[PDB]
Ligand binder design. Sequence first.
Ligand code: SF4
Length: 64
Amino acid sequence: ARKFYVDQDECIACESCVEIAPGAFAMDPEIEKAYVKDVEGASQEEVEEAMDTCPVQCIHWEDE
Ligand code: SF4
């Protein structure tokens, strides 16, 4: 079991990840920034490539 999430707080003005995860990553009006709105929204291989993108990443996994 391996989960994850992101620090939309460090999210800039790009959607590179959202493109590699148009279901888990998605900016919000409350966070005015992309965030793992649903770890099941994207797959780990999509969440992976989406992790490579991003300037400082600001994304990480969530064991257990
Ligand atoms: S790739 Fe990084 S900077 Fe671009 S929206 Fe996703 S979280 Fe934000």
